[PDB]
Symmetry: C4
Subunit: 469 residues, 4 copies
């Protein structure tokens, strides 16, 4: 048993072609896959961008239409500070709603009965929520509260082509005021993509938030969007359904070939392993079995499955049976990234072109072992900064934001702005400012000078082991 088949298996495509009449089908498939998958992603992106733009621009238009005195960029400071201001804002929202068709540049339709759960069939609900009992008397340092939340609702209806004016807010025990209503509009711009326009229903919520009871009432407008096909569409003028099929067939072929290669590898591993058990004791091999498994074909199969799922979802969206543009975009984009990466398989046969992969495979164990110890320090800093500085520092507001701030600091990014945020307000206490000084200096100097230096040293050390000289 000379066993030249083992050597044949771990051969490059050129070597396999020189050996047998083996034309490389997987490689040319992968090139075609890169081209077609990238083109499909871009084609989908046209429609996806149209949808996102429609949503965002309608929301901005609503903010200008319904928020008294609103200007772009003021969103996070937009607030009322007097009873008169609050009343004027609420009444302005309702009044603008009642005359929308006469003023708006967009073609909106009212949605009868879309006033929210506290609506009783009316199209707009004007709700104020307050404590069941509130007896706030700071003058005597006394209060009597029943924290039960009471909802008082006023129903408003559009004229088919007043009551809300008599609103009396219980300011001292007010929790919030909300305005709920729905508007319907058609995304006509989809015609530029030879698609039939969909019906969009925007659910608009305006909140006057007094939950802090701090004398300042933040005002915000949020929208939910529901996309569905029009009941009676008609376009007079009215290819990629076949391009999606082409992508699907290419990815199916790649999947089949890669699965055949994986089964071949499994069989070869099993035959070699039993022959070895015959050559010496039985059960010699524990991990070389895994070495027989090449992860590039696994990656390719995963990418094929993701691409097929994305293509099917895209076909459903075009067919109007689905409106999940974000999920489809994520599937297609991840697939595109993986398809581009997978071609690296054929560069690993040439050591001069495989520096990155070889280095990574030799460095990963030590890197992971080092990161075990770095993780505890990093998480301790994350939690400490999140709780201690979160109230005072804009960049420490949430756990994910604290992580972003610390990760950027490790990379030397946004350092002075991080210090200056504390200089600006000192945390309104010299002790908090001093703590921020210690926290930031220590974290930056540790992670930049020791952790990152040693991490890089491990990477370059691995490279030094694998480089030919």
């Amino acid at each position: 048993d000379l066993r030249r088949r083992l050597k044949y298996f771990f051969m490059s495509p050129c070597d396999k072609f020189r050996a047998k009449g083996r034309k490389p089908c997987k490689l040319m498939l992968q090139v075609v896959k890169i081209l077609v998958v990238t083109v499909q992603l871009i084609l989908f992106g046209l429609s996806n961008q149209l949808v996102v733009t429609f949503r965002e621009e309608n929301t901005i238009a609503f903010r200008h239409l319904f928020l008294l005195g609103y200007s772009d960029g003021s969103d996070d400071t937009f607030a009322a500070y007097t009873q008169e201001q609050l009343y004027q804002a609420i009444f302005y929202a309702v009044d603008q709603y009642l005359i929308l068709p006469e003023i708006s540049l967009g073609r909106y339709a009212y949605v009868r009965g879309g006033g929210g759960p506290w609506a009783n069939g009316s199209a707009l609900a004007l709700c104020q929520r307050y404590y069941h009992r509130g007896h706030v008397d700071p003058a005597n340092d006394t209060f009597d509260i029943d924290p039960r939340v009471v909802t008082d609702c006023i129903q408003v209806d559009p004229p088919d082509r007043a009551s809300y004016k008599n609103l009396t807010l219980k300011f001292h025990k007010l929790i919030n005021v909300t305005i709920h209503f729905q508007l319907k509009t058609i995304n006509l711009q989809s015609l530029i993509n030879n698609e039939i326009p969909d019906c969009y229903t925007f659910s608009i919520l305006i909140t006057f938030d007094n939950k802090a009871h701090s004398g300042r009432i933040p005002i915000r407008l949020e929208t939910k969007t529901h996309i569905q096909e029009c009941k009676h569409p008609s376009v007079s003028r009215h290819f990629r359904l076949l391009f999606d099929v082409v992508v699907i067939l290419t990815c199916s072929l790649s999947f089949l070939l890669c699965a055949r290669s994986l089964l071949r590898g499994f069989l070869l591993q099993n035959e070699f392993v039993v022959f070895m058990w015959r050559r010496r004791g039985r059960e010699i091999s524990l991990w070389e079995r895994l070495e027989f498994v090449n992860g590039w074909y696994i990656l390719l199969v995963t990418s094929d499955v993701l691409t097929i799922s994305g293509t099917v979802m895209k076909i459903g969206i075009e067919a109007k049976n689905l409106a999940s543009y974000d999920v489809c975009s994520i599937l297609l984009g991840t697939s595109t990234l993986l398809v581009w990466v997978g071609v690296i398989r054929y560069l690993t046969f040439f050591h001069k072109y495989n520096i990155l992969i070889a280095t990574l495979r030799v460095a990963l164990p030590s890197v992971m072992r080092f990161c075990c110890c770095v993780a505890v320090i990093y998480l301790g800093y994350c939690f400490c900064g999140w709780i201690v500085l979160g109230p005072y520092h804009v960049k420490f507001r949430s756990l994910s934001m604290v992580s972003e701030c610390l990760f950027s600091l490790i990379n030397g990014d946004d350092m002075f702005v991080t210090f200056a945020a504390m200089q600006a307000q000192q945390g309104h206490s010299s002790l908090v400012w001093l703590f921020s000084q210690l926290y930031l200096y220590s974290f930056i100097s540790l992670f930049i000078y020791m952790v990152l230096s040693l991490f890089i040293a491990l990477i370059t050390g691995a490279y030094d082991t694998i480089k030919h000289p």
Copy 2:
């Protein structure tokens, strides 16, 4: 005397378990400590955030209520430039104060007699301060000044449900005008945390600062906050007092075990040292005694003490006997960081996982010796930039800010903005701008290219000494 006990002492928890019936209690304790201390920090953070938000939002509301024409973001340029503007601002502040209940969204109560030290029982004090004698006559390049500061006060009282209008400011010798008053409000939002609301007393100071006599009078509003429990609270609806006890008991157990280990180490060191003095001359060992001391147990004991102190302070705050949220937050956060870090003790038994610690211990002496020489250069630059460029450069205003700017520059951060601040005004003199050019180029090129390179070289050199190959 075979002395296997010495070897037993410097053994890993797994080795100690294999040797005797020694179950690792300190390690599992540390894991439990990490969990419970982190959870306690987050739980405290809920309340701490509520308090901070109340303070900040009330201050912003005051700025909008009392500062004529105030808009968010203008705080550092907000100023008056004419006598009419100054008078209008002062009168607007007082007028808004007198009608606060009718306009404010928050429920504020006046504080009778809270008008400050220059108040004589009135709730608002309107004070102007000027030189005792001022005869400023620029026309003749003459002046006659008695720098004694005279305070002239006007008392204002709220209506229990005018005089200040006749204010005549001595502009040519005016130092500043201040408005002092106090407002009381209840932080009702604490109910969301199942806590009883506290009474907050805000001390409000508005300053029209003419100390520069420059024709521009900066206007600012500052608040002090005093938190105390309400006299007669009553909430109808109304666990972590036991979680704090759990944390305290866990940290006490860890403290006891670590102290026992430290005493054991001391005894072992003393016995080994006398046996060595018997084996050879007396008083051989000078520093290995210190090697017998393991600093991880010292760190753990310190963390336990800090955690207990923070927990006790938190219990006091909940009990309403204390309102020091910043001190408690700092104690708890530092404790959390130290508790997370301390688990690294058990990674030091495995050289593959101890790269950071081992490198640091070998590199620290050379790093400190190098930093001795770098410190003099750094401090010279700090003082030079603080005095020479502080007047002209926003980022060189104070010593701490100069240090932040230089430290960020060392890390390659905010470079062009630092240059552009000087380009914008040139320091209003070509000589100062040229000096800034030399200062910045020299500091950046020295510290980035030589100091940091050599510092990193020392770190990686230490790592090269300690890495197995």
Copy 3:
């Protein structure tokens, strides 16, 4: 055949001078070329800057003159949100146009018949474009559209020293409104450069873009500029035409000398190659022939040709036969860069001064081979981020912008701002935000820690091979 000529050829200028009576003409030429080409670039820059400034300042003035309520910096958010606002903006533009001479600080002349292609001889065209048939009825989730674009035009003429007021916009099917007109003005500031002023014709287009049909209509103003000489110029007061000739002659001399050197090298290579074919088998040498070619002379010849072309174009522009300032500026600037770089030729004879060039020549093959594998990963990330995040992330809007963002991220620049753009809106979906987290963390950690580290290792490895020790 001793063949000392080969050794003579690969000799330094000092060695050649010591050998024969060879004075270095190319080196002194290159120094003179650097001086004269740099001076010529700066001299041209005077005029170029004047032209650019005229264009930009006129455009800003038009934006202030014709865009109702326009303020600097609002350009990308400037939009209308109500029918009244749109009508007011359009009418304001036309009204300001009709009274331009009475109000504008610049001296503009109307251009009769410059109203655009849809003008029928009038100086201003006010066009609205809408669908041929539009029956948008969101109320019933129905529409009937003929996507044919209909253009309806109103002609306006200036008074030689109304109809447009009756404009009725078809809002529900409106695509856009445009205002086209032309203005003529003289760039008098060119007199400061002793040049005769040119006639500028600005083509002004104002667009009210409703292509999104989103209830928000962006308003923008764009200008095309046409530069031509005045028919009857007359300046009473009225050197570098000779400086351009000097530059041309210097570059011609350099070109001739370098071409002679290249021909000499070719002849020497051909003689050596045939002598070698005589010494051993025929056709021994395959690539040393190319080694006989020195690329510095090729670079110099290219720079000479570019400098001559730029100088000729500059002479044409001065003569008023050409107005292509950007092309000329690019030719002259590239030439200047190349002329400065080319002097490095004479530093390559001294190994202590040739570190950069020698390192680069040894490192380039491995660097290119490594970049082959890095390119696929980089392009996969580029496409994925462009499509998936382009709609949600300001820095991922276009392919070139995505490339700029990723390239800057590789260099550790603008990291936290990139994360915060996603924090601000979350992509309006938690799934998109999570994907952005994974995308950014993975790309940054891969490219900063592995790719860049290995790239630098390759560079320093090459340097280690070429450094004398």
Copy 4:
């Protein structure tokens, strides 16, 4: 001749003390010098800051008093766009000037005859400048210009407690309009520093710049400041004159000791050199003579001279014989930096503390040789970017600013903003944008990946040569 004196000379202070009764006077002097010079710098900084703040705040106040509609931050876009706007701005400036005492918060005095050179004894000059002959007729693409500048002046005088209203601007040939006047005020805040207030004369120039003739007229206000002592000052209440003498004496002592050491070194070098010429041929030594010269004493002497000059200038300023605060601040700050640095002399005797200095001395020759080649590339890029992109890119406006931009780019700073400035306007031509892409990508990749990597490699290589292992 055993010559132990040579070895004695190159000995550390501790070794010299152990050898003879040599107490280290220079070292303790240097410590005292650091303390006293730093304190003196800070003390001077108090006064310097007061002066700068007075100047800046008065200028801001003038901008608010005289610039119609001015708001903070608008300075670089502040401009007029219509004839009415221009007239209103000019008249507002003059009107506000005429009622300054009634409105301003500062105490300003008019300066009779301070209206500038074109004033004929009046306190305010209102000048318009225009071409001697201007016949701008864009309608016919004709012009007739006599570029001679004609100045037409209107004199305005303050009421001692109209004509300017009839100003007719020649818009079509207007070059600029200026308003010149002077105001006098006293810097009373200097009293807080126990100093007698000085008289400040502000020269105010307001420019309406039409030099571009672009339909947009930038408006700016600039001030010159002249400081002189008051004629008749009188302060009722009214140490560092002795602290300056203490600094002077300390620096004189250091100077004398260092000069004595330098003379000693010269004599020792001369004696050793002649003894060597006796031991072997004459004129053996060429450069070791220079090795006998220690540059730290030269640095110290330079620092002493600078400190003495700064102290004398500071004494003159306090005495009111001088007002050059910037020159004095620069002298004192540079002196402080040098005094701090000079203490490094005593760390060079201990190799563990001398890593930086030793590395630098071994690396400097190779670093300078490498920088020779890098300089040509850097300068070529600087000039190319300055001319080609200066008109289009905010960060390439001037040579110094281009250098700052490129230097920051080398350090990885402000990269995406540099790209985005070009994305925003594309240079208003796709060709310029493409060139910017090539320019930036090439410069960044070359300088970050090759130049900086090799520079650092040279530094660390030198360190590797000098490190003990």
